[model samples]
Target: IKVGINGFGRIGRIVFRAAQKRSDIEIVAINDLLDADYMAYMLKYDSTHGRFDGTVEVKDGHLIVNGKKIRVTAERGPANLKWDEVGVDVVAEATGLFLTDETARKHITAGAKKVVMTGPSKDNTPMFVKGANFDKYAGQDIVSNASCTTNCLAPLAKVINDNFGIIEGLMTTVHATTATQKTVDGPSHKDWRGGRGASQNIIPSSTGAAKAVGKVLPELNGKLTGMAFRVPTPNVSVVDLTVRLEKAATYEQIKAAVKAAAEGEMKGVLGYTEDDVVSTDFNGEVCTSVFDAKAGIALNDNFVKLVSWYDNETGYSNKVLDLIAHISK
Candidate 1:
């Protein structure tokens, strides 16, 4: 499959590097507002995942990395580029902008076979979390892989909802700062909290994962609520879940259930950790969800609590690659 990346930022660079390791996909072009020199610098050395194995050099507005010369264009939107000539089978629209179905489908209309947005969607487009509801990917022209938080939440929610139906839950993703956040206290926006200093404080922010989960699993509509704290950490995020289940189980059973899920239900994309694992320890993990067995408990009959950690960049990028493989087929 020939792939085109629409954003050259965090998720886009991860997707490019991830695809380079796979023999199945070739990254053809990158589209962003920045020039190739800056793009090359960011791709070569990421503060989160520092330095590529090989060098990234710019030659006539193209980035040379992983034995492929990827064309870097200044085009900022779907309507401004041509995917057919580049032989792009799929375009990973990683730009957090152009997230709706109507906007994303412009990529398809412009010549790509499918368009996968790396972020959550505002439209009813099929949302996929590989282990949770990837079975739903069937010839959809446009799809949102949802957020990294949804990728973690849906899998945990799936295991619980399958074994013991969910009552209601509140999930707080102790998230790391992203490109959307400001490094220092800044000017005003609708999100008052977001304008505050991201590094100096624990900023409370809204996460769409709770409501977005309903789209991936229709049974979960309005059953969950979530908020996020953008902490000082630059890597792995934690999910602290407090859920009420329809079926009651003991502490051992709840532990066993998640353990079973790590090995059985969510195999490749979910992991189990029993030792002392901090947030940084989970960085660069490709799994969407990893259980913290030490932190799980069945606080009474149907009330259950579990904690899971995920590498927001690497894990979700792997899912994006998986979705590209599925959609390109």
Candidate 2:
């Protein structure tokens, strides 16, 4: 299948690299406003993944990767690009801007057979978190592969909700820094975001994953609420969940539940680890959810909190690949 990438920014580029590794899907074209020089520079010096060899080349407005001539369009938005002309079967709209259902529809109108959005959608688009609810996407188009946090949180939420029903919950994502946050202190953009330096301060931000989770698992949509703290780190984010379950279980029970869930229900994506682990331990780990078994049941009884960590960009990018593969099949 031929895949087209709409934006070649941070997430877009990562999606490109990840797709390049896949044999089933080929990146036929890249649409970005930036010039080839800028694209080359960005791909060369990737902050999170580091540099790549000189395999990617530009020739006559096309990016030559290993011998394939992947075309490049200097377009900015979905409506502007001629996706049909390029013969793209699927378009991974990782621009992070064209996130609502309305914007996603634009890609469909432009001639993409299916559109996979990388971020959470504001509208009620069907959200899929790979291992959690990918079965729902048997023959669906216009899907949102929920953000990195959702990828980490949804599996854990599913395990807890399935075993011991979640009564009420709060999830605080100790998230890695993103391009959205400012490196230096500036005028607060919003009331809460103002004057806070992302590099120095742990600014509290809102996450749409709580709401998006409902679209994936309707049972737990409104039951979940979450906040994000953008730390100084560039990658590797942690999801700290505190849930009040309907039934009280012992600490051992909860640990066993998670272990069973990770091994049985959500096997590959969700993992259980009893070893004492730090943030850097899970830097590039590619699991859907890394359950710190040691950090399990931080508070027992009715309220149980568990921690899971993931590389926000890399992990979510991997999920995007899975979403595309599922859709193609």
Candidate 3:
């Protein structure tokens, strides 16, 4: 797949690095409002994910990343990029600003076959989570990989619903702070909580993880509800899910089931871990979600609690590539 990254932010940079590991994907161009020097510098040394593996240098208007020269442009909107000139098959829309179908459609209008949004869309744009319902993709021009929390919760919930049948569930994502929040205390018109200092406070915010998951898994349509607490951490987030199950399952049983999934069907997208771990431990993990085996709890006969961790930036970025790979092929 010949690819062009629309926004070279956190997710976009990670997507560039992740795609280098695969032979099937080729990133031919990158479009960000920033210049090539900053983009190449940021890609070389990341704060949370540490240094990028290969050498990155800028010459003229292009980025020479490990001898692969990817063209860099400072265009603001998709319509101006002229992706067709570069023969880009897919555009990874990680800008977070273009979340609607009409806004994202500008990429297709500019000449790209597909556009995958890194965040949720305002309209009913098709959303796909790799382990859950990625197979349903049938060459949709503008599709979404959904939010990071939805990507983290949907796959685990799918495993549970497939095995134990969820009656109702409540999710609380202990999420990391994003570029959306203010670094220092300031006024945010959208929401008051977003006005607080990101590193100084644990802000309670609304999340559409549950509803977004419903879009991917129809059986979970009204079965789940969730919210988020944006913590001070810069990367990695954990999903705490408490649910009422139709069938009774022991903690060991739940562990076995999730482990089976990590090793079997879900494989690389869904991971399992029994060792005690923290948020930073999963900084560069590519799995959409890592099932914490020890955190599985069976209360009363049919009630269960489960936890999973995800590198919100890296994991979700990889899944965007996964969807692009699947659709472009």
Candidate 4:
């Protein structure tokens, strides 16, 4: 399958790298408005980590990476590229711009056989989290991998909802810094998003993960609420989930529930850890979230708060790859 990427930002670059590892998929083209030099520089060295050995060369208006010839169009949106001409079978829109069904439709009209959006859709598309509802993705063109928070929270929400009916719940994602957060304290911009430095502060912000989780698991749509706090880390975000179970359960009961869920049903996507570890322990972890076996417990009487960790970009990028693989199959 020939795949085309629409953005070269953090998520976009990581997704491209992940896709390159898949033998079934081929990255035929990359679209970015920046000059070839700038795009080449970004691809040569990863900001979050060190340099990669992939060779991306520009020859006759095409971007060639390690013997794989991919065309890089100096464009931004879906309308700018010719997907049919480039023979792109799937287009992963990681631009973080088209978060609606209407914009997704634009990609379909632009000649992409399928569109996998990285972010949440504002207007209700078929939101899929690989192990959760990838079976429902057959015959669908427009799909969303949801967000990192949704990817981490959905499987847990499904486990709780399927095991001990969750009456109400709240999730707080202690996320790491992204390209959006400010590096240093500055003027307040975008109504409470600024005046905080990602390197020096823990700024509380809003997260759409809870809202997107309901879309992935319709059973828990109205039962979940979420918020976020962007900390001063580069990667590895954590999710603090508090669930109000319909039935009374003990701490061991909750941990057993999650462990059984991960093992029996959501094995590859969800993982459980019993070791006493910290945030940095999950630096390069690949599961959606690592259920801290030690931290699983009841908050009050019927409430259970669980701690889950994930390398947001890598784990979620792998999830997106899984989703694409399902669609292509």
Best by lDDT: 3
lDDT for 329 in candidate 4 is: 84
lDDT of 1 at 196: 86
Q: For candidate 1, which ten residues in a row score worst on lDDT? A: 71-80
lDDT of each: 0.86, 0.81, 0.89, 0.81
Per-model clash counts, in order, read 0, 2, 0, 0
Worst 10 residues of 4 by lDDT: 186-195
Per-prediction CA RMSD (Å):
1.4, 2.0, 1.2, 1.9
Please provide TM-scores, in order, for all candidate models, with all chains considered together.
Answer: 0.96, 0.92, 0.97, 0.93
Give Cα distance to truth, residue 77, candidate 2, Å. Answer: 3.9
Better of 3 and 4 by TM-score: 3
Model 1 residue runs over 4 Å out of place are none
- The candidate with the higher lDDT, 1 or 2, is 1
> What's the alpha carbon RMSD for model 4?
1.9
1-329 per-residue lDDT for model 3 (tens digits) = 99999888888888998998888999999998888888988888988878889888888888998888888888886799898788898889988888998899899988898998988887989998999998898778889988888988999999999998999999999989988899998989998999899999999999888878888999999888989999999989999999898888888888888999999999998999999888888988999899987776767768888999999988998898999888877
Q: Which pairs of residues collide in model 3?
A: none
**Mind giving the per-residue lDDT tens digits that candidate 2 earns over 1-329?**
88888888777887777776778888887888888766767876876777775487777766677778877778656777778888898899888787887888787888889999988876778788976789887687788888889998888888888888998888899987787777787665554573567878888888877656777888897888889888888888899898898888877888898888778867768878999987777765768688987776656577878888887877788788788888988
Candidate 4: segments with Cα more than 4 A from true spot: none
Model 2: runs farther than 4 Å from truth?
A: 188-195
